[PDB]
A paper describes a structure:
From these four complexes, the photosystem II ([name]) complex catalyses light-driven water oxidation and provides the electrons used for carbon fixation. [name] is a homodimer with a molecular mass of ~500 kDa, each monomer contains cofactors such as chlorophylls (Chls), quinones, carotenoids, and lipids which are coordinated by at least 20 protein subunits. The eukaryotic reaction centre is a dimer surrounded by tightly bound monomeric light-harvesting complexes (LHCs) and trimeric LHCII complexes. In this work, [name] was isolated from the halotolerant green alga [name].
The C2S2COMP structure is similar to the previously determined C2S2 supercomplex from Chlamydomonas reinhardtii or higher plants and the cyanobacterial core structures. More than 1700 water molecules were detected in the C2S2COMP model, the first detailed water molecules structure for a eukaryotic [name]. Overall, water molecules are clearly excluded from the membrane space in the [name] core, in contrast, the region occupied by LHC’s shows a relatively high number of water molecules in the membrane region. Two additional densities, unique to C2S2COMP, were observed close to [name]-Ser84 and CP47-Cys218 in the stromal interface between [name], CP47, and [name] and within 10 Å of each other. These were modelled as post-translational modifications (PTMs) – Ser84 appears to be phosphorylated and Cys218 seems to be sulfinylated. Moreover, CP29COMP contained only 9 Chls, compared to 11 in CP29STR and 13 Chl in Chlamydomonas [name] [name] (Sheng et al.). The average distances between [name] Chls 603, 607, and 609 to the CP47 Chls 607 and 616, increased from 17 Å to 20 Å between the compact to stretched conformations, suggesting faster transfer rates from [name] to CP47 in the compact conformation. Altogether, transfer from LHCII to the [name] core should be considerably slower in the compact orientation from both distance and Chl occupancy considerations.
Residue numbers in the entry:
A (entry chain t): 1 to 30
B (entry chain k): 10 to 46
C (entry chain i): 1 to 35
D (entry chain m): 3 to 33
E (entry chain d): 304 to 352
F (entry chain d): 204 to 253
G (entry chain w): 60 to 103
H (entry chain v): 2 to 33
Amino acid sequence: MEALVYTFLLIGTLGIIFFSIFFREPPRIA
Amino acid sequence: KLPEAYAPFSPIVDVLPIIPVLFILLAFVWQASVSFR
Amino acid sequence: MLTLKIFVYTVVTFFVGLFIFGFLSNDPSRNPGKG
Amino acid sequence: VNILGLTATALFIIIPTSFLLILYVKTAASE
Amino acid sequence: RAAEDPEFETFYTKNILLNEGIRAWMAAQDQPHEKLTLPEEVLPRGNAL
Amino acid sequence: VLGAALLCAIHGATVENTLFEDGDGANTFRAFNPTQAEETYSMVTANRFW
Amino acid sequence: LVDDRMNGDGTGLPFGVNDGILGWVIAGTLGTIWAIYFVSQKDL
Amino acid sequence: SLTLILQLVALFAVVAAGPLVVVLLSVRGGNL
Amino acid sequence: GRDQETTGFAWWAGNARLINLSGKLLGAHVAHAGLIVFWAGAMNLFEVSHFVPEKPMYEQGLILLPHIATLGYGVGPGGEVLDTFPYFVSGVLHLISSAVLGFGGVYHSLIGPETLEESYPFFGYVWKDKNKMTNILGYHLIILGCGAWLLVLKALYFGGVYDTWAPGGGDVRIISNPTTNAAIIFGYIVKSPFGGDGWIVSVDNLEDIIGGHIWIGTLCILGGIWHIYTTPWPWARRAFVWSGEAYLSYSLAAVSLMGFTACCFAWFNNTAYPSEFYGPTGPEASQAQAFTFLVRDQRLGANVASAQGPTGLGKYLMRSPTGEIIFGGETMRFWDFRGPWVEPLRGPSGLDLVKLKNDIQPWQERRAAEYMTHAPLGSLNSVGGVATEINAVNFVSPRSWLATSHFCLGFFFFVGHLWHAGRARAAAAGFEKGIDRVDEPVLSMRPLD
Amino acid sequence: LTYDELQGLTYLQVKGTGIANTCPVVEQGTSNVRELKPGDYKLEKFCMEPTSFTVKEEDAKGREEFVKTKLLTRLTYGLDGMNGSMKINNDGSVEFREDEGLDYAATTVKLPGGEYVPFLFTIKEFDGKGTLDSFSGDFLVPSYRGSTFLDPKGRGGATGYDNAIALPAKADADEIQRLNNKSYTPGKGSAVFSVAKVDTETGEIAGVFESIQPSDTEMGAHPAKDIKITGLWYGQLT
Amino acid sequence: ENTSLWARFCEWITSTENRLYIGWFGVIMIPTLLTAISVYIIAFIAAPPVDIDGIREPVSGSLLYGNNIITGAVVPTSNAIGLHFYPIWEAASLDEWLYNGGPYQLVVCHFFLGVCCYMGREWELSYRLGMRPWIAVAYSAPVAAATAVFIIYPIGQGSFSDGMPLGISGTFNFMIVFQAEHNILMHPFHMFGVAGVFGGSLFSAMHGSLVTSSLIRETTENESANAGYKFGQEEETYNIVAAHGYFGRLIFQYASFNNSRSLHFFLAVWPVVCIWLTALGISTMAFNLNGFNFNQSVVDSNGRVLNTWADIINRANLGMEVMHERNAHNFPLDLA
Amino acid sequence: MTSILQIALLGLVLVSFALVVGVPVVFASPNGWTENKGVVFSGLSVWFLLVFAVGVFNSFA
Ligand code: CLA
Ligand code: CLA
Ligand code: CLA
Ligand code: CLA
Ligand SMILES: CCCCCCCCCCCCCCCCCC(=O)OC[C@H](CO)OC(=O)CCCCCCCCCCCCCCCCC
Ligand SMILES: CC1=C(/C=C/C(C)=C/C=C/C(C)=C/C=C/C=C(C)/C=C/C=C(C)/C=C/C2=C(C)CCCC2(C)C)C(C)(C)CCC1
Ligand SMILES: CC1=C(/C=C/C(C)=C/C=C/C(C)=C/C=C/C=C(C)/C=C/C=C(C)/C=C/C2=C(C)CCCC2(C)C)C(C)(C)CCC1
Ligand code: OEX
Ligand SMILES: [Cl-]
Ligand SMILES: [Cl-]
Ligand code: NA
């Protein structure tokens, strides 16, 4: 049960990392 | 120990290894004397 | 295990060869500089 | 404990996530 | 889990043992007001060290 | 503390390596004048790199 | 012995090649990449 | 002691040598 | 000297000012070589003046006298020093030669020609002159091959060198029949660097060492002639960067690798770094403690073959993962250690039980006890032992000093290689001073990075 | 490999090969076995090499059997260099005694399911009676852990806390088999040896063995399992 | 039209239009780091216990074996293996490879290769963008530190069991045993490293606070001040002169950094050189050079030892030493 | 012969110190090298002579 929670939290953090990398707001040269 | 004929020069032997350390400090002295030109 | 070792040797050799011949492929010319 | 820690973790995730999602979605609708 | 299973070891349990060693070997000289004169036989130690 | 040391090192390196030329000479520390109204390093290039 | 193992550890083995097929696949992979790079040179 | 005195004399001589060279080149012309 | 206005280099980069001054660069080099030979001679004279005959060299904080003793000067059987006059002569010769080198360096730095290209075309060079660069490299390769052959001549005809593997506890030996087999020689260079293999640090006999030096000398001379009579091929001319800073970066990477390797030689090798002069290695000291506590309890009547520790593995003897009989305890990690005092006790299966029961020599026992008490563990204020031991003995192993210093030097020279390789690439490409601010490349690139 | 050619190789070319864990094989000789001179012999260079580890196990459906394992430790399970004496009579009766040597090897196997079974593969103090084709006997199986072994909480038999001290109010009356005592009572194991090959020119004997012994009890804890070791054995006489 | 296969592959590899730059350092970096990441995640979740000390006494390490995020670790390789390079194909079975600590060596070797090629890739992208190349030199300091704790210290100690465990409580165990055996707190290189991290925090806070203090008014109070900066604006967003004037009036009008480039060079060089020093300290204590041993340094006229704070530290270190590896030592000296 | 060697080595130390202090001074002096040629050559020659003399007298001391 607790291993489920730990693995879920770790993969959720990694998903946030993935989204922040590949779906970031693009910096605009303007 | 040094050879017996060279034993009285042991005091000046004991100072020599620091002279390479003194050279880089001498470079800094020369640069200060030219005001770090 | 020997099959695994052969496969890993092939993989490592492939990537190392890519590295070596990539820097052999006129790499100092791959810059945006002038001259 | 096994279940009170579970609900504490779930609430600590979801409620600030809800707050952040509310603010982000209104901002992104405002471009 | 460690109390009901003698084969369960983690780095956390190793650190707990190390903390016990720190306290026991430090207290006598580190807290003189405690007046702790603990004989060597009661000090937690490992094998041959 | 460790992230702040990382930030200090990485920001100093990024600024020092994204500098504009701004003057002839291999000593870049003389290419900055404190009374100037332009950036001395390329934020666009630093952002692209990182 | 109760089980099989390569027993290649130690012994000062050249590139860790306990079977000549390993040296052959190393040479083949390196030579294939070299051949691609060589027949593909003067193309930049 | 004689050993310590001679070590100190040698130390002072070697320490003063290079600075004396720089001082002499400063007061005697230049090109340093 | 020069200023920043005419060179573009500040005083803290002032040596860069003489990148394109051949004569002054030569003067800096020759003065520096004089400095190196000065340190060699002065440190050697310091070590012989502080040398005390009854104690072994490693107890006296000496790092150069072990080198000359390994060359085989002034020592006898068992590493016992017979005369320190060869060491004194080495120190004096270095200290005198340093004066000539210093005079040459000071001359070429101060009043020599700034550039050698005009009046001395043999010595004149530009960094882009790849033929002249290969000529200089060839001359230096020939000199290095002659140095390796000097080591070979000393080993074969000029008294030999110290063999720690000689029977009875090592002695100075003439090396007859060096290992010239190419398979054996280049196996070392293609060995793994890990435990049990050790790459080239695991060379364990003077025959292999001297045969490898014959190979290195001949290859260096042949490559020197090759570089004198050849020009770099077009693939090399496209692969490399042809400038003084780039050449310096290549040398920095090479000497960083050499410094790390020398660190590992000092820490692990007991053949080229005999324990009689350098003290035991770490593995040697651990195995010596295990052997001493084996022989003591054997003398106390205990059976060292059936005795098991708290874990059940065996207090004195256990098995390596490949089955060899090895010393028990944590020194199992050092089960691949080989030393002159333990290899007579090893049969094909490892530590032989009947040899450990009956065939233990007094010199082996004395070396084991000595090496147990002089393990390479100490503090940087030279307090011997583990960090918890009190200030009683004054000992840090020369192996420890050499390994620590040369790992540090190898790491800094790796960093310097990175610095100079990057700056050489950036200077060749033309943006070592910064972005042009009018032709910025990223502004010409497609967005979204 | 024969013992002669094993001694004909050096430590450098044996190192890393695994041969150091392998018993010598009597390549010469004959299999008559009874064509051996009877008498009193000094058993010397006794060596034992397992070829299989099996663990007695009980499944859900009610079937007991010796299941196959995966050897977790490396080639450290060999016994060699043991000494003793053995008595051979003209009728074929044999008595077998092992005095001392490398007569113990800590081994760990993995059961299907991921369970670790550590045991002490030992043949020490082995009394064996029988015939030349088979003799059975008993040997002492010591405790896996010595009395000074400490658990991850520091508790142990001849050294330690004797209670869980991380719990200021929980060490009493329920973890008695965990903290109140750490038992190191020794066990016994059964073995059957069988001579197969013999050479009377040199006195070397060899054969197969089958042993059943208890595993580790974890210092008075979770009950031991029965380990069945089949393997080869070798030795020299007088 | 440059139709060659290798030319097309090379143009894709060295392309600056990829979202993440690959380069020739990246073609080694990406597979090694992906291998290390995969094995680390799988081992951290579900690896069986590892006999780290080689005394047949395994350490669990993984979540499925009862660890939390703090106590979970990838356990270092068995002491019986030492430095002997244990890959999967050198094991009789995956179970033996897991029991003996093979995942640790796999992850450490691939991580070392990946971070070296990460540094090279940093140089490569700086070169392809027309930048100055020394961000890789700055990144060499954490690379040196990781190499020291994962490779160099196991080399000097003779066993990968002495590597830092890939975990949090494992890291704490590594630190505690390291202090017990080497007195790292009394090591000057470690003191320089502590000064470097503390100074890096101080200088990061100082520089950020000065730049934020001298920000020029471009927005309103209802808007975030960050909105006063636009990405790619030519002009400076803060008053360097005002920030320098405040700093000079704060401590000393001299000993300042009115040159912005000199200031940023200082910010780069201080923590990097100090982390270099402390990584070298770890690497030297790998060969047992240790921190300052001042035990029983102060004695009175009659020779009685006057204990000091160094002696109190020594008592703590004795408690640390007599408890680590409680069953692994058979002989009094901890030479191995 | 030992006293002769000691006197020669003392003179060598003095000449070495004189060369160390003077050769850079003469080299970097304005037109100092073109005027002190004889003095510098005499110092170098007496230095080499003293080195050879000490080396010879070592075999007799
Ligand atoms: C074979 C050695 C070698 C060579 C020949 C040079 C040559 C060059 N380097 Mg250098 N460099 C190298 C190694 C080398 N370096 C290494 C090992 C590093 C350190 C990681 C660097 C880092 C580097 C930097 C950062 C820079 C140079 C630059 C230069 C140029 C000017 C140097 C100058 O004026 O310094 C003058 C000398 C000083 C200012 C003295 C510095 C004080 C030092 C740190 C004292 C250290 C003493 C310490 C006790 C030693 C022990 C430490 C440790 C081992 C325990 C010159 C062409 C410059 C350049 O790029 O110009 C084009 C430049 O900025 N180099
Ligand atoms: C290993 C040490 C080393 C070496 C061999 C050199 C070599 C050189 N440097 Mg220097 N330098 C060094 C390190 C070194 N440096 C470091 C550490 C720094 C940082 C401060 C610098 C920074 C630097 C700058 C800023 C510049 C150089 C330059 C020079 C060159 C011209 C010398 C000159 O005109 O000085 C003149 C100096 C003097 C007149 C005073 C010293 C006189 C001598 C040399 C003292 C030696 C005493 C010695 C014991 C006598 C031996 C006598 C013999 C018979 C035994 C010279 C080749 C210059 C250059 O590039 O030239 C174009 C330049 O501008 N250097
Ligand atoms: C490869 C280098 C090397 C090695 C391995 C050693 C090894 C040895 N030497 Mg030796 N020595 C060397 C170079 C070396 N030395 C040099 C270059 C000199 C000239 C100073 C000497 C002169 C010397 C003497 C005069 C003596 C020794 C002694 C010793 C012994 C003890 C050393 C000790 O106590 O250190 C103590 C530890 C240190 C001093 C730490 C040094 C820290 C580094 C170098 C500084 C780092 C820079 C700093 C932290 C950051 C600032 C950067 C920049 C601003 C500068 C040891 C066997 C002693 C002995 O027993 O001889 C018989 C002795 O009395 N040596
Ligand atoms: C402060 C600077 C410093 C100091 C004082 C030293 C000092 C030392 N280093 Mg060094 N080192 C340093 C910088 C330094 N290092 C740096 C910057 C690097 C690169 C990172 C290295 C790389 C390095 C390596 C690779 C090695 C040393 C080693 C050594 C030791 C012996 C050096 C030696 O024998 O020279 C060698 C001298 C020469 C090469 C000059 C030519 C000598 C000729 C060929 C000798 C001929 C002898 C002949 C056979 C005699 C017989 C004659 C006749 C009868 C035939 C010595 C303690 C060695 C050591 O002990 O390992 C731990 C070693 O292997 N160092
Ligand atoms: C474990 C087994 C492997 C052993 C490892 C060591 C092998 C020896 C490698 C030494 C190569 C010496 C450097 C030559 C120049 C390298 C740069 C280059 O190339 O520069 C390029 C340069 C440009 O013209 O080329 C040239 O000058 C000509 C260079 C000759 C290239 C050598 C190729 C030899 C044969 C390769 C394998 C046969 C390949 C066939 C495979 C096809 C599919 C089966
Ligand atoms: C360029 C330059 C530089 C550098 C310089 C140099 C590096 C120099 C040097 C030099 C050198 C490197 C020198 C050496 C020397 C030597 C001498 C001078 C000697 C001698 C002799 C004697 C006299 C001895 C005696 C004795 C004996 C025989 C034995 C017994 C003891 C005794 C000691 C007595 C600088 C940085 C500054 C700055 C810039 C410029
Ligand atoms: C004496 C001795 C010996 C011998 C040794 C030897 C024989 C050695 C050698 C060796 C060798 C024979 C080596 C070689 C090497 C090589 C190297 C080290 C390399 C390299 C290079 C590089 C790094 C490259 C890079 C690149 C690429 C990758 C591509 C692109 C371009 C370029 C070119 C940049 C012995 C041990 C026996 C014994 C003891 C002593
Ligand atoms: O693993 Mn971690 O801690 Ca370095 O000492 Mn030996 O090993 Mn173990 O004991 Mn002490
Ligand atoms: Cl621990
Ligand atoms: Cl131990
Ligand atoms: Na212990």
